[PDB]
Amino acid sequence: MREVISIHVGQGGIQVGNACWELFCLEHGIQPDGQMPSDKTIGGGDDAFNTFFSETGAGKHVPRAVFLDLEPTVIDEVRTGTYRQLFHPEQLISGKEDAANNFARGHYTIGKEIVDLCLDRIRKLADNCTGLQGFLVFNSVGGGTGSGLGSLLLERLSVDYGKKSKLGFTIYPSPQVSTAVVEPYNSILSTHSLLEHTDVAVMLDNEAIYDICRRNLDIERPTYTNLNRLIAQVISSLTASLRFDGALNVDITEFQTNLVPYPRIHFMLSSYAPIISAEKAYHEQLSVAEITNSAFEPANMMAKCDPRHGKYMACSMMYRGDVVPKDVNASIATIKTKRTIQFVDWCPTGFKVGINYQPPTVVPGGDLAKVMRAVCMISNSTAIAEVFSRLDHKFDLMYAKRAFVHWYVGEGMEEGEFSEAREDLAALEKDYEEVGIET
Amino acid sequence: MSLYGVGLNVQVDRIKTEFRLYVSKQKGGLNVRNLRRIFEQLDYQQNGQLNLDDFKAGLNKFGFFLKNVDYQCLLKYFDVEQNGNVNYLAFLSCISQTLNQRRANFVLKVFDSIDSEQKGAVHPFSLAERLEVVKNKDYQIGSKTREQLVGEYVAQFHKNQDGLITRDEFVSYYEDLGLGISSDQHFIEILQTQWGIKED
Amino acid sequence: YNLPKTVPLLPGHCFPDHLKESHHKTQQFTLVNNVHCEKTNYIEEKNDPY
Amino acid sequence: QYAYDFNPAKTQSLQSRPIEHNKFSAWTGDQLYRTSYGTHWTSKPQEPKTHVPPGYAGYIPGLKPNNHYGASYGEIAKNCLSNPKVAQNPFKLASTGFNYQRHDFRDPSLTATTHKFGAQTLLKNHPSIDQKSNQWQSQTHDSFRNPLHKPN
Amino acid sequence: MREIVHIQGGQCGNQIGAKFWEVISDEHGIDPTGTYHGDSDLQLERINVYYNEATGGRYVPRAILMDLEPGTMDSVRAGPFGQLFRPDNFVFGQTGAGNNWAKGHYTEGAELIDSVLDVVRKEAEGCDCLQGFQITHSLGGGTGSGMGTLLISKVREEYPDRIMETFSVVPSPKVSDTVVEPYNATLSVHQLVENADECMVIDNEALYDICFRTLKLTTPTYGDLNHLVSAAMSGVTCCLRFPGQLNSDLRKLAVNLIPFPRLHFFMIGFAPLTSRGSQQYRALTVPELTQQMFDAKNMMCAADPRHGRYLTASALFRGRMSTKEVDEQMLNVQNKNSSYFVEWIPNNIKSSICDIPPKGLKMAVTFVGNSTAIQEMFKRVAEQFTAMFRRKAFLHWYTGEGMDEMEFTEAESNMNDLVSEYQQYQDATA
Amino acid sequence: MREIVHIQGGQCGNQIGAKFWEVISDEHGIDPTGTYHGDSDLQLERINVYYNEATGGRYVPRAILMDLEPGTMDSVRAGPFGQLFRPDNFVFGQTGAGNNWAKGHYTEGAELIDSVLDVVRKEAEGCDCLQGFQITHSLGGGTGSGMGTLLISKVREEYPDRIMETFSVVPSPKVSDTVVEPYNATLSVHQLVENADECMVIDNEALYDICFRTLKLTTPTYGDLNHLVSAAMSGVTCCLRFPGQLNSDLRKLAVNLIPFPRLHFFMIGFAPLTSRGSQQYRALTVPELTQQMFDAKNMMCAADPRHGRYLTASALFRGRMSTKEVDEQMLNVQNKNSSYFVEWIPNNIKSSICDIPPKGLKMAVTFVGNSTAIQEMFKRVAEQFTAMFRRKAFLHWYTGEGMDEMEFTEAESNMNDLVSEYQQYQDATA
Amino acid sequence: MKRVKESYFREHPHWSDINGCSGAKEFEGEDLAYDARIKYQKETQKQWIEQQIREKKMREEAERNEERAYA
Numbered sequence A: 001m002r003e004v005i006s007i008h009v010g011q012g013g014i015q016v017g018n019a020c021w022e023l024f025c026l027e028h029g030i031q032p033d034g035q036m037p038s039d040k041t042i043g044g045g046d047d048a049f050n051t052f053f054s055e056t057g058a059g060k061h062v063p064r065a066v067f068l069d070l071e072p073t074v075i076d077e078v079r080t081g082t083y084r085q086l087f088h089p090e091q092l093i094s095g096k097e098d099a100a101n102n103f104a105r106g107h108y109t110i111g112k113e114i115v116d117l118c119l120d121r122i123r124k125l126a127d128n129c130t131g132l133q134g135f136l137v138f139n140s141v142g143g144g145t146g147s148g149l150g151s152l153l154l155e156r157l158s159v160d161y162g163k164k165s166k167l168g169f170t171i172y173p174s175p176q177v178s179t180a181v182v183e184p185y186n187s188i189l190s191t192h193s194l195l196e197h198t199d200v201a202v203m204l205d206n207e208a209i210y211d212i213c214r215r216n217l218d219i220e221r222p223t224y225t226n227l228n229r230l231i232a233q234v235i236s237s238l239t240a241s242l243r244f245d246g247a248l249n250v251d252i253t254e255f256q257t258n259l260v261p262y263p264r265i266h267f268m269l270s271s272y273a274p275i276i277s278a279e280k281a282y283h284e285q286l287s288v289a290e291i292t293n294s295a296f297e298p299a300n301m302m303a304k305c306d307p308r309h310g311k312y313m314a315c316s317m318m319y320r321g322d323v324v325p326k327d328v329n330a331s332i333a334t335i336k337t338k339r340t341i342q343f344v345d346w347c348p349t350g351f352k353v354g355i356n357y358q359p360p361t362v363v364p365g366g367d368l369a370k371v372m373r374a375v376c377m378i379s380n381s382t383a384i385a386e387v388f389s390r391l392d393h394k395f396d397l398m399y400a401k402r403a404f405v406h407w408y409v410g411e412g413m414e415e416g417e418f419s420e421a422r423e424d425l426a427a428l429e430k431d432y433e434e435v436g437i438e439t
Numbered sequence B: 001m002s003l004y005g006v007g008l009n010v011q012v013d014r015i016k017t018e019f020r021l022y023v024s025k026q027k028g029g030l031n032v033r034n035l036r037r038i039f040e041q042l043d044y045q046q047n048g049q050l051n052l053d054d055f056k057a058g059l060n061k062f063g064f065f066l067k068n069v070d071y072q073c074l075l076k077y078f079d080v081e082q083n084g085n086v087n088y089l090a091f092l093s094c095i096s097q098t099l100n101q102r103r104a105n106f107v108l109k110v111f112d113s114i115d116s117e118q119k120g121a122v123h124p125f126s127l128a129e130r131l132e133v134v135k136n137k138d139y140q141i142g143s144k145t146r147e148q149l150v151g152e153y154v155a156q157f158h159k160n161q162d163g164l165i166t167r168d169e170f171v172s173y174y175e176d177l178g179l180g181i182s183s184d185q186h187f188i189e190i191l192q193t194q195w196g197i198k199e200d
Numbered sequence C: 001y002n003l004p005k006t007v008p009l010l011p012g013h014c015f016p017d018h019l020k021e022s023h024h025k026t027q028q029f030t031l032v033n034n035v036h037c038e039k040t041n042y043i044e045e046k047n048d049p050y
Numbered sequence D: 001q002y003a004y005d006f007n008p009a010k011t012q013s014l015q016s017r018p019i020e021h022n023k024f025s026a027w028t029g030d031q032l033y034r035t036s037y038g039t040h041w042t043s044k045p046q047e048p049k050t051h052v053p054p055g056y057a058g059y060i061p062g063l064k065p066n067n068h069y070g071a072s073y074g075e076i077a078k079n080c081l082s083n084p085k086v087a088q089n090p091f092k093l094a095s096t097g098f099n100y101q102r103h104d105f106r107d108p109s110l111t112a113t114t115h116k117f118g119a120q121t122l123l124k125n126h127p128s129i130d131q132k133s134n135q136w137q138s139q140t141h142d143s144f145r146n147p148l149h150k151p152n
Numbered sequence E, F: 001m002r003e004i005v006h007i008q009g010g011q012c013g014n015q016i017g018a019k020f021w022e023v024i025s026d027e028h029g030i031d032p033t034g035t036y037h038g039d040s041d042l043q044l045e046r047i048n049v050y051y052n053e054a055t056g057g058r059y060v061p062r063a064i065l066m067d068l069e070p071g072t073m074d075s076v077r078a079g080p081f082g083q084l085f086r087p088d089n090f091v092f093g094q095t096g097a098g099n100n101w102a103k104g105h106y107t108e109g110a111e112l113i114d115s116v117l118d119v120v121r122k123e124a125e126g127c128d129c130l131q132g133f134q135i136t137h138s139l140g141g142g143t144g145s146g147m148g149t150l151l152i153s154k155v156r157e158e159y160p161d162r163i164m165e166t167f168s169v170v171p172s173p174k175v176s177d178t179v180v181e182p183y184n185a186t187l188s189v190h191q192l193v194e195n196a197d198e199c200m201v202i203d204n205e206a207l208y209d210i211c212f213r214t215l216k217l218t219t220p221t222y223g224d225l226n227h228l229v230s231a232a233m234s235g236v237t238c239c240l241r242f243p244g245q246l247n248s249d250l251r252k253l254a255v256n257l258i259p260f261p262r263l264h265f266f267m268i269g270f271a272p273l274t275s276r277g278s279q280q281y282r283a284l285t286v287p288e289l290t291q292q293m294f295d296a297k298n299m300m301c302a303a304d305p306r307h308g309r310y311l312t313a314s315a316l317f318r319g320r321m322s323t324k325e326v327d328e329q330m331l332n333v334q335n336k337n338s339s340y341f342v343e344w345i346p347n348n349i350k351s352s353i354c355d356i357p358p359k360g361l362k363m364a365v366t367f368v369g370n371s372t373a374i375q376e377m378f379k380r381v382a383e384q385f386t387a388m389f390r391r392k393a394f395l396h397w398y399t400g401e402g403m404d405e406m407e408f409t410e411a412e413s414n415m416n417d418l419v420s421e422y423q424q425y426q427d428a429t430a
Numbered sequence G: 001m002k003r004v005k006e007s008y009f010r011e012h013p014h015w016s017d018i019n020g021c022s023g024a025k026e027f028e029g030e031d032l033a034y035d036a037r038i039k040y041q042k043e044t045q046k047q048w049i050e051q052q053i054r055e056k057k058m059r060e061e062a063e064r065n066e067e068r069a070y071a
């Protein structure tokens, strides 16, 4: 009686959403078709799949997932591929016209005709669930489609349901590796959407993933497919504590009650380790002592934000593998002593340590090497001002000559919205560095 | 390395110096003939040819490591029939000395003592008794399973169709232990220490 | 041993040939209308019923 | 004993090699295979699609042209994509538009006219023999594909 | 889904469609007879983008062919792939424009607009979700420049939202084909800039220079020339028809290419295009693709892109390739020539990836970018215009069909204003 | 990594380049067709130092051959090993040099240098980490030293860091190869001093002298003389290609041979070279290698070195040999000829080791020394130049393309200035 | 979630195992297999090394087959 529903919007989410299900798919003993293999006939035990699936009364398990999009090309791929029989056939809402990176388009004109269906579909699933613990939303902010509907969806999700928690895995554009040219304009407008609407947001910028892939995995020709695999793992460990045994467990609720110092500042950076290719992965000791250190290593911060340029507020780290409680104590104490990694003045204790037992699983044909000790950290640091500052400057240069301002005004978005949107971004800064001053 | 001219010799000339050197340092159970028999399990057809991967690891198992450049250096001059596969027969044709006549006389004189019937073939048991007797004093003249129990001291050699130890092979199986040992006296001393028979 | 079968390139092992029957040069380079254009030898198929 | 020779291994030039021939598509055996899915479970081109659920959108070939009688969207699509046609070379004209000079584009729906009548019958798109009322097809007791057979 | 109907006018317009259809039918395996022969599943997934359906299993291209003289449209029915078109749809006149704009624009061609629009009205309504009109014609022909321009004006007012595309070929300075070229070319863009959402000028001068310098082809022919555009034209829409990593429709490209309302002219090119003498000394790798795709000699417009600074551009990578090396090369391209990328708009390259490559090749690139260098074409045409007008030569033919010299002055004034306003941003600084 | 692009100009630039590309082909065991047939990995693991890649594993030498006339370009192609260079790499005009610098620096070469800078620009960007450039051309030729010089000036201003190397062949008056040689040669040096990082000069007379005395052969042809220079080029760049005891890249040789920026001229040579009637009983050991190396008559510069004092010199030995005997010999030389070594730079000899000898031999070495003896080469040219200028004979040719009389006067001082400044350190004492 | 396993290596014992445990004379915490368990996992880690590498190598050849086939 503990379940979480996933809400996906945008092409970036769809691809990342598509991959994230296989990791769950192969982790619960469920083949693609949707029922247990015929080889194992011992009746039925487990019940662990109840966290992310619902019993249909006969055989196949239907994922509690909902997909949205305004352009059908990406969605058509899933419904025609080998995963055809798994997803609920009617909750893959599909559009007929695309936003075309017009944050206004999906938020004022077209999304209105799709906001209705999604809300109706989601409310139905919530009825089936009994102990709904929270939602998960994946999206990319570099495209309007995700920014628009995703912004609208969260605004509605914080009113009807009330006290249910929400998690947000957004994707802001990389510092200088950019795919679009108008992302800075709609990137800022998106910020006000989840600034006061989402309980927890996760920074998962792109360019870092490339950095991790090249230096660790030893691949010189990576593609989007391998980029997803790392992210899906991050989802694996965060929720891994809900569907396996543990001598010290942490529910989805016990992250935003410890990792958010104040109501405003609730963005925490996410990092993962170890990431070592099979060609050398097991050809180093892989002891617990070294694994934790790489968690705080500057280079493996999965977000392109320099953490040493700010203080660490509070960190809750998830351990999954074969950790004995002495291992956690011995390693954790060392990090505190370090003079290269410091903690804010008024946060003496800033570690929330959890232990999980089920080992990480390796997908066939993958790069990650199946190890017996891994660590996941979701930490909030004041350094996040770097990413926000950069997105601030890029906005100023273009708006000065009123470049591109026309379309977001001619789609039905009042030109005045920009004036208020910019202030909050400036306002967000002054409280980010106010809390960083020692008493 | 720049094997345009006699370089095939120079690279081969040096490499044999290292390999023969390594066995001498070990000098123990590691024997050249082990490698001779080893490769059969890799051939799979008894044609004497093995791919690049098979040859390298097999030499790795014995305990001899070389530079990457050499392995292709070994490949070229032993790829006689231009197949891309090295011939272990020739490779085993080398690293097998002819033998100095100081050992041969020590070999043949010892053979003369063993074969008191001048037939030229050795029954396995007779060699077995002398080897074990030199190790114990009260070993008693009789036992229950002398044949099988004392035979495992032997059969590291091989017999002919008749079953006796032929003159040709017996000399063969003492020289092959001549690569792990590089001292002439100590090679001699082994014989009388293991045989209790010393004449030179 | 492995003796080479012909002399390798070296300072004086070529010092053939300059005393040949006839020396003719074919213009492989021609300049027209400010664009480079050259001959099409060494790429010629022969024929076929394909 | 001889001069210096250029060619090592005596590699004859491709110029004189036997002939061009039919191995052009040695690469386009896996060329038309998506990578958005694919490389997740399989490595060769996705096999032809035999079933579609509601919401598939793009152009099932048989739906729009000929008005099919009412039925479940799953069933109607199955008949069109599971039958022959939509394949096979009736005239052998190549895609590259080269077999065009081989063919004639002649239609067997002609005769003559003038001095009486000039209408002429219609082309081969015409139903016949299958003339049979609606209640004939829809109603029968069991002589159909069993709705819940699914051999195990 | 989200398909686009095709309307092409003028002889140059008819010819371009003559091969653009032949190629596009090749990509989907639609034989000239009209029966299906495709191989994979893709060749029948999203074919609605350009093809409609009818009984008989044969596929009808949804093109509209409009010429003011019967000769061109009669020819298209004779060559290969000359049977897919709807014979019913052809609309043709009786006299001929005589390479005079007004004659085919104001008196007769307008008189013919009664039916041509009627067929178009029916065509657009037929499609479930119309995505735009891609129009191809020549500015060197009086009727094509007029009938094409007259058709656009009526169409735009009828569909204020649906996107609009144009393929215009402007006469180059050296290789001219018409003596009256300066007049019609200058006075027709005025009709295009106000109503044409998008434009991609093509310079006949560029083709020949590329033909001799790129293809090393001894005897080019207009059959070949029509091919280069035909392939490239498919580039802008190719990713719309097939599944891919990052779908990019025609709308999105317009979204990231035009800074302000009044600059909607782009210059494009195609690569790789390797001549037959050297295909076997080069190497096909992603970095090799881009070094030819932003270089001057491969562009389709005779204006050198290095005489000015780019504003923004998008590259539609085609084929199966992975992005990481794509991003590095692109960021490498922009950050190595800071003098050629305006300094007030960071991250000034767009990226798109589609999986299906053109039959027989794995990778290629189609480029679309509005570069300030384009002013050279508009500037040069404007100058030659001033030479003729000052003496009122060739004026009587035009003045005899309603329009007088008053509109000429207005067009020149607007033509100059766009020319100047274009260069205001080039020297602008932050 | 750290690859270098070879760009040559002129008949001497071409011919010299032609053999040099042939010789380097054989060391790595590359057949004319371009397919690989090597034996050991030592010939590939660093093969990227000079070569690009392509589909089918076929290597294409990254060459840029430039000339103002077709005649020299035509010849090299028709010979063996001429199929390696690709077509697009070539660049040429249609007028001719006419043994005139003026035709080589102001009017003709300018109108074609744009492309070469375009072609050369492609190689530098493509390679991972450019290590430098090398230049081969003749000062006695109009375009050779004339046009190739322009490429040097343009290239220098485009990359402030990359190393620059140039093989030069000055015309000795003894072999008066051109009566117009004196003006171009004096003109050429002025450009070479200010820009080229390193300069290597060779006198034709020695090559003929070397052929008749050491090799002792019957009928040399320009093929043979081009052969000795080719290997010499292999010596300097050899160390970076093969593994060895001590690594010595190109920049290291400069770092320890040019005491001041104004004195960067060296004299090179090759050894051993023995006649068929002289090789029968010549020993093969280090002592014989160094004995011939520092010999006066074997050096490839007409100015006999021993008339001056050695500033700095380096030795690049190749092939296996004990490091001791190379070290001991160098100590031996620096003592038995004390008067021949400068005083304020003790231990002024460089040595290096490489583990692969050229095919067919056992020990070889390439020598490079900056000796004050070079003042003879300028002095003979310098005195020569002044003689025929006071009458301004032949002056009208150069003044026919815009050159001003001041330039010739200017060039006289700098070359005169260097001569005075070069010999001042000879008499300096500590 | 629940807590069934005291440690990743051993389960809670059957009641017949804890005969005493009334006084602190048995603690089961010293492993007494620590040498054994570490020895076992050593070779086990090796198999996953070998499997992935050999699988990884094979995909390379097929990868070389594609591009070369293109040749």
Ligand SMILES: Nc1nc2c(ncn2[C@@H]2O[C@H](COP(=O)(O)OP(=O)(O)OP(=O)(O)O)[C@@H](O)[C@H]2O)c(=O)[nH]1
Pocket: A009, A010, A011, A012, A013, A015, A016, A071, A098, A099, A100, A101, A140, A141, A142, A143, A144, A145, A146, A147, A171, A173, A178, A179, A180, A206, A224, A227, A228, E246, E247
């Ligand atoms: N890490 C990662 N980022 C992605 C992926 N797909 C898209 N993105 C990001 O999304 C941005 C562009 O928007 P998309 O997500 O592709 O598409 P969209 O946000 O739905 O907007 P539309 O294309 O109009 O539907 C790019 O800058 C990427 O950073 C992905 O698979 N992985």
Ligand SMILES: Nc1nc2c(ncn2[C@@H]2O[C@H](COP(=O)(O)OP(=O)(O)O)[C@@H](O)[C@H]2O)c(=O)[nH]1
Pocket: E009, E010, E011, E012, E013, E015, E016, E097, E098, E099, E100, E138, E140, E141, E142, E143, E144, E145, E169, E171, E177, E178, E204, E222, E225, E226
């Ligand atoms: N590149 C190219 N240009 C063409 C082609 N056909 C026509 N043109 C151009 O069209 C111009 C003449 O067009 P014209 O026939 O008068 O157009 P119309 O008045 O609408 O019939 C010439 O300047 C050509 O440059 C073609 O097949 N290829």
Ligand SMILES: Nc1nc2c(ncn2[C@@H]2O[C@H](COP(=O)(O)OP(=O)(O)O)[C@@H](O)[C@H]2O)c(=O)[nH]1
Pocket: F009, F010, F011, F012, F013, F015, F016, F067, F097, F099, F138, F140, F141, F142, F143, F144, F145, F169, F171, F177, F178, F204, F222, F225, F226
């Ligand atoms: N030794 C030698 N010298 C050459 C060769 N080719 C050219 N030269 C020299 O180049 C000079 C003439 O060069 P020139 O034709 O004027 O060069 P250009 O200006 O590029 O045409 C002569 O003095 C020759 O000594 C060659 O193959 N060998």
Ligand SMILES: [Mg+2]
Pocket: A011, A071, A098, A143, A145, E247
């Ligand atoms: Mg999209």
